[PDB]
């Protein structure tokens, strides 16, 4: 989707037995805060004896990118469901924002594994600080020194239906 990164913090409802229950935080990539709180309860009921009825959302905050104009390489650890089983995978993306890398990831697993948004768990998104942290060649090839490349065969979009001159593709 078009996503944002949210910090969602929640807790069990206080009891007379336990008047300060533990606060749990999650980083959720969701299009909006309604899905952010839904995904929060979705993972808490996978990890704790809690429900939305017996729990409480304490805080929802947008986490903005620290350096939205610095080009980074992200490693994303995933857990997705296929038609047959459940698989763990690790993939790498180049982007300036963490959210845009997660958006690329969702498009990429839709394209390469037919994995829908509901079938994917994002275990972890990490910015790879060192060039040695990059394991995948399809993003390692853009970390070479003095990288140049042309864009052969440029196709120009025309405003008119008919053109009086021969097409060209120089660029």
């Amino acid at each position: 989707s078009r996503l944002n990164e949210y910090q969602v913090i929640g807790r069990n409802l206080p009891t007379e037995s336990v008047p300060e229950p533990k606060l749990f935080r999650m980083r959720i990539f969701a299009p909006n805060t309604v899905v952010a709180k839904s995904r929060y309860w979705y993972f808490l009921q996978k990890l704790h004896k809690v429900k939305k009825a017996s729990g409480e959302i304490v805080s929802v905050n947008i986490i903005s990118e620290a350096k939205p104009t610095k080009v980074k390489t992200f490693g994303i650890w995933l857990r997705y469901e296929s038609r047959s089983g459940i698989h763990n995978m690790y993939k790498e993306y180049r982007d300036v924002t963490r959210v845009g890398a997660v958006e690329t990831m969702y498009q990429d697993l839709a394209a390469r594994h037919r994995a829908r948004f509901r079938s994917i768990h994002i275990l972890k998104v990490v910015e790879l600080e060192k060039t040695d942290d990059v394991k995948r060649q399809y993003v390692k090839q853009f970390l070479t020194k003095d990288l140049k490349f042309p864009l052969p065969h440029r196709v120009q979009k025309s405003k008119k239906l008919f053109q009086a001159t021969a097409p060209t593709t120089f660029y």
Partner: protein, 199 residues
Amino acid sequence: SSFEKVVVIDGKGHLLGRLASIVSKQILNGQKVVVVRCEELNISGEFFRNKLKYHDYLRKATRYNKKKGPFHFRAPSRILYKAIRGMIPHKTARGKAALERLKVFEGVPPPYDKKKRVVVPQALRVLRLKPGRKYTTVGKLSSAVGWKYESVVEKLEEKRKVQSAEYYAKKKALTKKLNAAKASTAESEAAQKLAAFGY
């Protein structure tokens, strides 16, 4: 976007169905279209694949009387015509008039050999197909399925290109002389004012 009296399209290098859809909407909207050089049209996919498709087309014929069945035309212009007519409501009076607005040819016969031919970028093979894909030339598919006049068209096309080259050499020479005269009349009062106006 202008309404033209006749739009003459040079069919060389155009993808068959994309040109067909554009021409269909043009003639439906009251525009007269002429397509020349239908032997130079293109279909995506290898030649063998398109030949197999045409043989599938040839398989279809009325069992009880072959003379009633589909009429499989082999000429490139007629292949383009079939593509267009499939995109036209040809069984209505409006579709019939729209089809009367269209002409398709092999080569560039008179009077269109001395007129302006345009291209349609949305249907050009070099602009549409991914640079590695395979395509077919409709002239070769037509010869492979029964068209008899390939070599006549190419003989007449070589003669036409020789005459058009004599034309172009003369036009270029007179353009060079007119450019030298416009250079002579440059830096004149009218030229300076037209330069301040953008002309």
